[PDB]
Design a protein around this ligand. Structure first.
Ligand SMILES: [Zn+2]
Lengths: 76, 187, 48
């Protein structure tokens, strides 16, 4: 299946995934495609922040579902 | 008055309008922190109109800090806020309470991810004890590639090569006299 | 704060002495002096 990850910068990432993929695995794919490290990423679906050790099917994420990505910010 | 901004790699960058007031107003809202020698960070938020970005809001997220770092802590509530009001992230800003004006490796790693999603993303650093500031971005593509490839341990560590640059004056960032709204989500 | 010694990363305090650290900073650093005297900050680069 495919899912979409909308960023707050107005861009939409498309990802090929399996329902049994862990959120951690989805983050690693976002790193491979977009270059963003997993530890900086927070993924949200339907009001819930998604946990690294759970899977897409655990949150009932389906084909063409849209997740949202927000990044950790760190400076100094 | 028409500006064409090109990255090193030949990519054209859209204009970002930045309110003149933002730097001053940012230092004002984060002053209690600055005076306690604590770094503070903020988000540059705005809208896309007619192929151009406008920074309309300075958002101060929930965060933690030391004299040498700041970091957001509840990005889900920040997403909620931005999502509800249809605010894009166009960049960010932070203070160096006692340090000179520069992008650290921490800031560079943070900003790389934003710039990869939005080629126009900018990072503003205020150094109020020096009374200096600057607006920065990574060299595109080489600077971004350097940070993407980096696996060096240590919160702060050095990089080979120039990596980043101050935005051109004039450049894709255009400072205008404009209204400004600050949203402070802190608790 | 972390500083660089060309390259190792050191965790240090402004009040740490050059002795406590053990050096040039783009001036040789006297052993009885502290880091703060030379306006050394995060990511400042020293040479062994
Ligand atoms: Zn690095």
């Amino acid at each position: 299946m495919q899912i979409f990850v909308k960023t707050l910068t107005g861009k939409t990432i498309t990802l090929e995934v399996e329902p049994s993929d862990t959120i951690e695995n989805v983050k690693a794919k976002i790193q491979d495609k977009e270059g963003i490290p997993p530890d900086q990423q927070r993924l949200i679906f339907a009001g819930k922040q998604l946990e690294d050790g759970r899977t897409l099917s655990d949150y009932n994420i389906q084909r063409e579902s849209t997740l949202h990505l927000v990044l950790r910010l760190r400076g100094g | 008055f028409k500006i064409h901004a090109y990255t090193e790699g030949g990519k054209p960058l859209r204009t970002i309008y930045l309110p003149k007031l933002l730097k001053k107003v940012f230092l004002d809202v984060v002053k209690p922190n600055t005076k306690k020698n604590l770094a503070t960070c903020g988000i540059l938020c705005g809208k896309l109109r007619q192929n151009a970005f406008f920074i309309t809001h300075l958002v101060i997220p929930l965060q933690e800090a030391t004299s040498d770092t700041c970091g957001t802590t509840d990005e889900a509530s920040l997403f909620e806020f931005q999502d509800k009001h249809n605010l894009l992230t166009l960049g960010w800003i932070h203070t160096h309470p006692t340090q000179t004006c520069f992008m650290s490796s921490v800031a560079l790693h943070t900003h790389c991810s934003y710039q990869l999603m939005l080629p126009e993303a900018i990072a503003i650093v205020m150094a109020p004890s020096k009374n200096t500031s600057g607006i920065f971005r990574l060299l595109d593509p080489e600077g971004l590639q350097t940070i993407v490839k980096c696996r060096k341990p240590g919160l702060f560590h050095p990089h080979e090569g120039k990596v980043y640059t101050m935005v051109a004056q004039p450049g894709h960032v255009r400072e205008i006299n404009s209204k400004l709204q600050v949203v402070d989500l802190r608790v």
